[PDB]
Amino acid sequence: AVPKRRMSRANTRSRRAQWKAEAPGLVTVSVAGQQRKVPRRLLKAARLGLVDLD
Amino acid sequence: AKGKRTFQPNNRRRARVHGFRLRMRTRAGRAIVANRRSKGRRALTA
Amino acid sequence: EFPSATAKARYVRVSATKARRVIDLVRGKSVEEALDILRWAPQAASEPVAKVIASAAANAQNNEGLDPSTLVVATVYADEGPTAKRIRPRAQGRAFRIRKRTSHITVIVESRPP
Amino acid sequence: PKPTKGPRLGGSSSHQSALLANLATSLFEHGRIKTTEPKARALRPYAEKLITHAKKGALHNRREVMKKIRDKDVVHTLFAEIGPFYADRNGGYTRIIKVENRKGDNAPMAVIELVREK
RNA sequence: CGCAGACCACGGGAUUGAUAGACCAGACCUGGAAGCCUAGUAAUAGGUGCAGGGAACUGGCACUAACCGGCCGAAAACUUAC
RNA sequence: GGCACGCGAGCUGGGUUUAGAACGUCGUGAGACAGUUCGGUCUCUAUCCGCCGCGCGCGUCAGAAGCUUGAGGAAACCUGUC
RNA sequence: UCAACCAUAGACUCGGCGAAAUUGCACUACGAGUAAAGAUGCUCGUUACGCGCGGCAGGACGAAAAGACCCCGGGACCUUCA
RNA sequence: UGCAUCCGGUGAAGCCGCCGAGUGAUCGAGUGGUGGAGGGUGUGGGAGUGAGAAUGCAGGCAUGAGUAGCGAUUAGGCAAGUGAGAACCUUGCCCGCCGAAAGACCAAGGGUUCCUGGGCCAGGCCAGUCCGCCCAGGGUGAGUCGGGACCUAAGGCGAGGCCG
RNA sequence: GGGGAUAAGCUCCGUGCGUCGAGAGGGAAACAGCCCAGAUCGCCGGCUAAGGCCCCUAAGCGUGUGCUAAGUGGAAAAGGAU
RNA sequence: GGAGGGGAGUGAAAGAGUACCUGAAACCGUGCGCUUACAAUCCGUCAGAGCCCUCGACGUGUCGUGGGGUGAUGGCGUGCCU
């Protein structure tokens, strides 16, 4: 089908504000004497030397 | 399944039909040149 | 009125909305933390923003001699730049208009002691 | 092993089975492989069962392995080294390790290893 | 991870552990494996032998993974009656 | 019996009502018949209200976890033979 | 009758590129009624926490096409002892 | 624009304004910011002389929407590689598809698309170190091949000519 | 007054009759033509019309004498009934 | 990585950077103040609480021949043109 009206500013921006993003929950790692912040999902793989840390 | 469009190109045909010689072969087809030759054209006839 | 440093990025190939989707995370986050968030973000607009933020921090360090850990991402905004048109074709002899968008991106980092 | 609960892994049971066999081949050939996650989740059990056949070594176990993987170098590898090497470890030969996602489609990725601790 | 489920939600567990997968055993489905031996001209049949194989059901086993962790989240007072 | 003789952005398309064709009757003729006869494209990604379900947020004068009362609403309500 | 189960392409979730027709407005309920005689917008009452997601398709006399049936005006083409 | 006078790089117009005015169309020779060269006043003259609507024209930008789709019924994968950056680019081993075709050779047609080197802000329905994309350079060799210089059909043009 | 069924928000005529058209404001629950009244602009002044004075809604659950028992008031006929 | 940018410079001015005189509106966003999650809104108008900014007369903060932005709540109120 097809809309019928020019859906307003309020409604538009309101719903548009649901299309957002969340940030992964970060955690320290003692990468060879120094520290970097990495998700928890990848913690073991970092401590074992696979994660490409730039 | 017949999607045969109108323009199956050829060139000998193009020139024996829409060509210079066959424009100049008559009277009406010269005047077709006299407008194009005056209007400002570049490719009077293929 | 704390000492600031500025950084821009112009004629970038990411639509501004898909930039703002990320920037909402880091308005107010510290520099280091934002850089990391953006390293580990699943969005394809995180890398330009990363480059801009580290650029501003670097300009603050070199050109205005500031400590890199007293910093925050104070003000950020992405805006719409030019727009290029492409007549992409479609059925029944119709032709619709893609608009390839771009975006400018602007960062201003203060230097805030606690 | 426990079948896929939903739709399959590359577009059919055929392609699924072929894919699992190629990946077990590569695994036993190298020791690590990096692949998207549900493939690993689907490839722990398959591979552990092939390994168990290797442990309980025999003509019959060997043929019932060769009727999947199609690579004699890799079956020789199993029955020569990987079989006895995992004698006493009763169960649990593989390991999964998640890693950085993939650029093209954000898809998960995981490195599946064989353990080496006994 | 689930017999909960469009995603999210819901339910359980999270080394002070049997949640899942594997492994051992069992139940059930199929129906008498391969190899060797024998009889046969050969097709093939018989023995070893409820054999072997195998997915969800069940009991056990900590062998692999459940991590050496991040984030949210708590008190203006005021009057009568007491 | 009603609700666009309920309901085609839900389905059909036999009829009726496009172009083809034929019979009867009228018309000199083109052609016509609330006469007949065989055939004949049914387009749309649901913006809003509405409705069935499901979430996020905030609230109920501190923050939280369990057990629940019941205003008010819904579902069910059929019948027979020896 | 009388429908049930399975697999693939979609549909749903995630990452990327990214249009469309349509559009007077807008923080757009229901009823009985009134009215250019079928009311989201008026009256009088009843109900409803803000914002979203999947899905259905009753209405918005929904979108499309300055009606193709009818009538008027102008043309066109066809006919005939005009 | 005719005529007379006034302001103007010691900052006109135009634009954003604030403060104010007129019964109204409107006004500020009242002042700030921006900005950089012409304007105002009174009287007369002349008008392409005032737009909110023409299913109006041209350009730009929104809602729908960060939604539908991303072009078949063959199916992709692992290691290594250079690279800033790899689901797709190069190689290795697998795997799978067509196999009177989805294979090899010509005609029409198109016109450098071919090779090498370099390149990736545009394009490819994503990205791309890749490409029929971009740039430069290079490259097509005929006594016997398909045509002409050899011949003619359909048909064409048509000296003279006949008709008009 | 005609036509009509002495039906139509029907149709057709008359009318120094009206209003709407071109006419706001008040009352009529909302309501172009009904009743009142014909808007030069302002005032945080007063008196009145139509209509109305229990609350919603500003003004009287006003005074006096009688009826109503039907929620008449706040639709209705032929006819029936101490 | 490069695009692009920040300093240093040129220049009278880089609010003249080869996307370049001026540089409007629609449109797109960032900050600051008020307001908004028990409510039925042609989106306004009349009254107006409360808070925030400002000018002025004064006095330790304070009303005013004030002015401006928002504006809870109440009444009234049926888009523009043809």
UniProtKB/Swiss-Prot annotation, chain A:
<dbReference type="Pfam" id="PF01783">
    <property type="entry name" value="Ribosomal_L32p"/>
</dbReference>
<keyword id="KW-0687">Ribonucleoprotein</keyword>
<comment type="similarity">
    <text>Belongs to the bacterial ribosomal protein bL32 family.</text>
</comment>
<dbReference type="GO" id="GO:0006412">
    <property type="term" value="P:translation"/>
</dbReference>
<feature type="compositionally biased region" description="Basic residues">
    <location>
        <begin position="1"/>
        <end position="18"/>
    </location>
</feature>
<dbReference type="InterPro" id="IPR011332">
    <property type="entry name" value="Ribosomal_zn-bd"/>
</dbReference>
<dbReference type="InterPro" id="IPR002677">
    <property type="entry name" value="Ribosomal_bL32"/>
</dbReference>
<dbReference type="GO" id="GO:0003735">
    <property type="term" value="F:structural constituent of ribosome"/>
</dbReference>
<keyword id="KW-0689">Ribosomal protein</keyword>
<protein>
    <recommendedName>
        <fullName>Large ribosomal subunit protein bL32</fullName>
    </recommendedName>
</protein>
<dbReference type="GO" id="GO:0015934">
    <property type="term" value="C:large ribosomal subunit"/>
</dbReference>
<feature type="region of interest" description="Disordered">
    <location>
        <begin position="1"/>
        <end position="19"/>
    </location>
</feature>
Curated annotation (Swiss-Prot), chain B:
<dbReference type="InterPro" id="IPR020939">
    <property type="entry name" value="Ribosomal_bL34_CS"/>
</dbReference>
<keyword id="KW-0687">Ribonucleoprotein</keyword>
<dbReference type="GO" id="GO:0005840">
    <property type="term" value="C:ribosome"/>
</dbReference>
<comment type="similarity">
    <text>Belongs to the bacterial ribosomal protein bL34 family.</text>
</comment>
<dbReference type="GO" id="GO:0003735">
    <property type="term" value="F:structural constituent of ribosome"/>
</dbReference>
<dbReference type="GO" id="GO:1990904">
    <property type="term" value="C:ribonucleoprotein complex"/>
</dbReference>
<dbReference type="GO" id="GO:0006412">
    <property type="term" value="P:translation"/>
</dbReference>
<dbReference type="Pfam" id="PF00468">
    <property type="entry name" value="Ribosomal_L34"/>
</dbReference>
<keyword id="KW-0689">Ribosomal protein</keyword>
<protein>
    <recommendedName>
        <fullName>Large ribosomal subunit protein bL34</fullName>
    </recommendedName>
</protein>
<dbReference type="InterPro" id="IPR000271">
    <property type="entry name" value="Ribosomal_bL34"/>
</dbReference>
From Swiss-Prot, chain C:
<dbReference type="GO" id="GO:0006412">
    <property type="term" value="P:translation"/>
</dbReference>
<dbReference type="GO" id="GO:0022625">
    <property type="term" value="C:cytosolic large ribosomal subunit"/>
</dbReference>
<comment type="function">
    <text>The globular domain of the protein is located near the polypeptide exit tunnel on the outside of the subunit, while an extended beta-hairpin is found that lines the wall of the exit tunnel in the center of the 70S ribosome.</text>
</comment>
<comment type="function">
    <text>This protein binds specifically to 23S rRNA; its binding is stimulated by other ribosomal proteins, e.g. L4, L17, and L20. It is important during the early stages of 50S assembly. It makes multiple contacts with different domains of the 23S rRNA in the assembled 50S subunit and ribosome.</text>
</comment>
<protein>
    <recommendedName>
        <fullName>Large ribosomal subunit protein uL22</fullName>
    </recommendedName>
</protein>
<keyword id="KW-0699">rRNA-binding</keyword>
<keyword id="KW-0687">Ribonucleoprotein</keyword>
<keyword id="KW-0694">RNA-binding</keyword>
<keyword id="KW-0689">Ribosomal protein</keyword>
<comment type="similarity">
    <text>Belongs to the universal ribosomal protein uL22 family.</text>
</comment>
<dbReference type="GO" id="GO:0003735">
    <property type="term" value="F:structural constituent of ribosome"/>
</dbReference>
<dbReference type="GO" id="GO:0019843">
    <property type="term" value="F:rRNA binding"/>
</dbReference>
UniProtKB/Swiss-Prot annotation, chain D:
<comment type="similarity">
    <text>Belongs to the bacterial ribosomal protein bL17 family.</text>
</comment>
<keyword id="KW-0689">Ribosomal protein</keyword>
<comment type="subunit">
    <text>Part of the 50S ribosomal subunit. Contacts protein L32.</text>
</comment>
<keyword id="KW-0687">Ribonucleoprotein</keyword>
<dbReference type="GO" id="GO:0022625">
    <property type="term" value="C:cytosolic large ribosomal subunit"/>
</dbReference>
<protein>
    <recommendedName>
        <fullName>Large ribosomal subunit protein bL17</fullName>
    </recommendedName>
</protein>
<dbReference type="GO" id="GO:0006412">
    <property type="term" value="P:translation"/>
</dbReference>
<dbReference type="GO" id="GO:0003735">
    <property type="term" value="F:structural constituent of ribosome"/>
</dbReference>
